Write a protein that binds this DNA or RNA. Structure first.
Lengths: 115, 115
DNA sequence: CTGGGACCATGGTCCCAG
DNA sequence: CTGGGACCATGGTCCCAG
């Protein structure tokens, strides 16, 4: 099963050109809900760094990828930072699975840091 | 007492005009250690928004303004973004207070902290 | 057209209790 | 050990409202 990130790349191009950016058009073409295209496409927007955090790109579900991207909209730099920070954890040997990555990543946006 | 940020602005001007980039010159003028000028100036270099995180600009110490500035040098976007974040949180009713603010901003750079 | 909300069955994990 | 209940996130679909 190709990764959400991957699908998103394809969906992305097919939109810009093959369908004049008509999500609905592409959807029918791919014979799949529009949301699915949205979710994956937004995932493909995530920084290459953030993708790397996962062993296998398939570990980043379209659903979480989508939410991640929306969450860090207009804050790509913050995202990139967090991403690197986590990269050092594993660099220093630390290990956390998929489900955690998104959490730790998103953490910076949550107040539970101090409260 | 005029806040560091304020002093910073005034200093930087005289520095750019009345004394053509010569800290020592300005220092002699204001009759205060060069360090002070440096601290305030860097403080005035902080994004309006970052200053805005505090009720009164006076809440931002020259000392912190300085460290904050140096800390995020060549990372102004990151700072602005992280400032937004903290702005949205207190927008959602969260409450911070001076000391906590500067610490929160800086947390982003810390591998241990952010993750 | 488009995004978002309400839903859905599924593969799958945990863990309790015979 | 073994089955079953309680959950869970996911991929998806529908369909409403801007």
């Amino acid at each position: 099963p190709t990764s959400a990130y991957e699908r998103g790349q394809r969906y992305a191009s097919r939109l810009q050109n093959e369908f004049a950016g008509n999500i609905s058009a592409l959807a029918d073409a791919e014979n799949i809900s529009r949301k699915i295209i949205t979710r994956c496409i937004n995932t493909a927007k995530l920084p290459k760094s953030v993708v790397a955090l996962f062993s296998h790109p398939g570990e980043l579900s379209a659903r979480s990828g989508d939410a991640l991207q929306k969450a860090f909209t207009d804050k790509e730099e913050l995202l990139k930072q967090q991403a690197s920070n986590l990269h050092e954890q594993k660099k220093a040997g630390v290990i956390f699975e998929a489900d955690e990555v998104i959490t730790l990543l998103t953490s910076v946006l949550k107040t539970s840091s101090a409260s």
